[PDB]
């Protein structure tokens, strides 16, 4: 009776050992996958950020360009207008 008491406790003890072992293995895998994936996304984000900045710069160069384009239209207009009053003044 105790013989079976003892046997079954012994069996539990091995079961606890095995389960503690798997659980500790699993915990580690999770900590590993967190660390890895954390490191990845950090890198990804860094690239994305570098690209994003090259993009800001490009956009700023286009603002300068569009600005000169609007000046172009304004000079052309200032001539046209001046030049119309002046055909009247002949």
């Amino acid at each position: 009776e105790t013989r079976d008491q003892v046997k079954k406790l012994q069996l539990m003890l091995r079961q606890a050992n095995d389960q503690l072992e798997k659980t500790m293995k699993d915990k580690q895998e999770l900590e590993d996958f967190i660390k890895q994936s954390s490191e990845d996304s950090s890198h990804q984000i860094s690239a994305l950020v570098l690209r994003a900045q090259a993009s800001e710069i490009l956009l700023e160069e286009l603002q300068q360009g569009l600005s000169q384009a609007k000046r172009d239209v304004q000079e052309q207009m200032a001539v046209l207008m001046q030049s119309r009053e002046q055909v009247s003044e002949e």
């Binding site: 008491q5 079954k8 406790l9 069996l11 539990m12 079961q15 606890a16 389960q19």
Partner: protein, 82 residues
Amino acid sequence: ISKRVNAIEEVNNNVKLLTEMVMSHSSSEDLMKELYQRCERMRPTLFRLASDTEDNDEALAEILQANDNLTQVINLYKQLVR
């Protein structure tokens, strides 16, 4: 012993259901893998109870019997549902 009992009742009720679930498995695999999982996390509960039976010879025995039935359906599932 109110919780000793709920633990054991829960175990006995479910070993029953999961045991069929396994057999009737050679969709459904979904409800099943889930029960198996709950039944795995019941062991700590049985371990702790069993470690707590101060010479209550008989209560201890009820625990271990339940651990038996549990072990057995856990062994089945691992062998068949692989």
